């Protein structure tokens, strides 16, 4: 069922589009809360953002990096938080059978 690549393997181009989009929407805190990241993880993201870096990229670094989550799981998270345009940006790295939810 889940044959998608690990989030950490997402090509830089698509990753940059996704993060730029999520940062504009400013949903990093919503993402972190939804997966229940710990205080130190939340602060690490907030911290990176204050330093001018992408908050969502840091979220992917933590959630995708340490927990080895897949693009499909990321797709499901977006689906739960109704981030449809985020889902569309990664539709090409997920099974076509899931495009109905976009």
């Amino acid at each position: 069922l889940d044959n998608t690549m690990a989030i950490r393997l997402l090509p830089l181009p698509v990753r940059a589009q996704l993060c730029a989009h999520l940062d504009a929407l400013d949903v990093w805190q919503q993402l972190a809360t939804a997966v229940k990241l710990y205080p130190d993880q939340v602060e690490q993201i907030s911290s990176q953002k204050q330093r001018g870096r992408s908050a969502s990229n840091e979220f992917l670094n933590i959630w995708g990096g340490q927990y080895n989550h897949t693009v499909q799981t990321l797709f499901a998270l977006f689906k739960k938080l109704k981030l449809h345009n985020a889902m569309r940006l990664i539709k090409d790295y997920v099974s076509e059978d899931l495009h109905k939810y976009i």
């Binding site: 950490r8 997966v35 229940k36 959630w63 340490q66 927990y67 797709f75």
Partner: protein
């Protein structure tokens, strides 16, 4: 299995390059600190190596092997070296040779401790690459859990 290592294989016996690949994984988000901090003190390593043989709550009654201070020595020494220096590598070099008789850490003990700290990227790597086993199960809640599509 026709795996490279077994749960009873001591970490010091694992090929240096294999430990290095694991180290780079643990270097991300400074996860080596999380693993190092929960290593139980005085474990009967061989007895704890088998699957489900390391009862973390029972093992920690004897306290933890390292303290927040032992973790610093790794940070300190590595900070003197170039930015690309692997702190996880130094952590494992110290841990792998630690203990006396049946105190030397093994792949099985490492795997179970990785799971306890939710270091799934490292745990999946150890399960697949080292043991040729399937990736460990995920919790139902929290950052390590999977998300279903309605």
């Amino acid at each position: 299995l026709s795996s490279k290592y077994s749960r009873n294989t001591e970490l010091r016996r694992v090929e240096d390059n294999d430990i290095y690949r694991l180290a780079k994984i643990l270097d991300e988000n400074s996860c080596w600190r999380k693993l190092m901090s929960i290593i139980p003190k005085g474990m009967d390593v061989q007895a704890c190596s088998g699957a489900g043989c390391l009862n973390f709550p029972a093992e920690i009654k004897k306290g933890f092997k390292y303290t927040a201070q032992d973790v610093f020595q790794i940070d300190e020494a590595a900070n003197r070296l170039p930015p690309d220096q692997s702190k996880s590598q130094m952590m494992i070099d110290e841990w792998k040779t630690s203990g006396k008789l049946n105190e030397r850490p093994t792949v099985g003990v490492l795997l179970q401790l990785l799971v306890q700290a939710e270091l799934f990227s490292a745990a999946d790597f150890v399960a697949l690459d080292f043991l040729n086993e399937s990736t460990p199960a995920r919790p139902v809640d929290g950052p390590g859990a999977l998300i279903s599509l309605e």
